[PDB]
Design a protein around this ligand. Structure first.
Ligand SMILES: CC(C)(C)[C@@H]1CC[C@H](CO)N(c2ncnc3[nH]ccc23)C1
Length: 167
């Protein structure tokens, strides 16, 4: 039993809700919140910009030190950093950005990072400003993640389409 509330159950391990991931994280304080990161951990917009803003830019400060030490992530890769005031940890995961021409096949590799964590609050990878089809992202999530994932979808219209079209 966990404290996630109001989710629709899609499969044994995947749950979905129309919610603002920032507000969800602040309420639940999950062990792991997933960020829709880029390889430079520049949290300018989309989910990343919103999460970082909620940390009063502390996420960005920590991220800049991480990059200065380690260099950029790989597309499809991840790193674990602090969750600041939102979660114990933030798993920064880089899905392919279609608006940069990146290979959508890397979306499965991106979701594989979730399997290193027993329970996660997450957005749909590569959705939103990353340019991929969110219906496809949900399919890859369900077919790749085996741990317990609670998906927050900001757009109510999109949430309804994701549910109604789910096979
Ligand atoms: C449109 C984007 C590529 C930016 C993605 C797409 C999937 C959903 C749709 O809104 N996104 C979010 N989900 C949950 N919480 C969120 N907080 C802020 C954004 C957001 C944004």
């Amino acid at each position: 039993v966990n404290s996630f509330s109001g989710y629709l159950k899609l499969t044994d391990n995947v749950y979905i809700k129309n919610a603002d991931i920032v507000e969800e994280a602040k309420k639940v304080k999950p062990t792991v919140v997933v960020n829709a990161a880029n390889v430079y951990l520049k949290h300018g917009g989309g989910v990343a910009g919103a999460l970082n803003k909620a940390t009063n830019n502390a996420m960005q400060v920590e991220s800049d030190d991480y990059i200065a030490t380690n260099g950029p992530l790989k597309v499809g890769g991840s790193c674990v950093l602090s969750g600041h005031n939102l979660a114990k940890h933030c798993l920064h995961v880089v899905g392919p950005n279609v608006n940069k021409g990146e290979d959508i096949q890397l979306l499965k590799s991106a979701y594989e990072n979730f399997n290193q964590h027993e329970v996660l609050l997450a957005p749909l990878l590569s959705a939103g400003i990353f340019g991929a089809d969110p219906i496809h992202s949900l399919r890859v999530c369900v077919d790749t993640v085996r741990t317990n994932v609670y998906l927050a979808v900001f757009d109510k219209n999109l949430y309804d389409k994701l549910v109604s079209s789910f096979l």
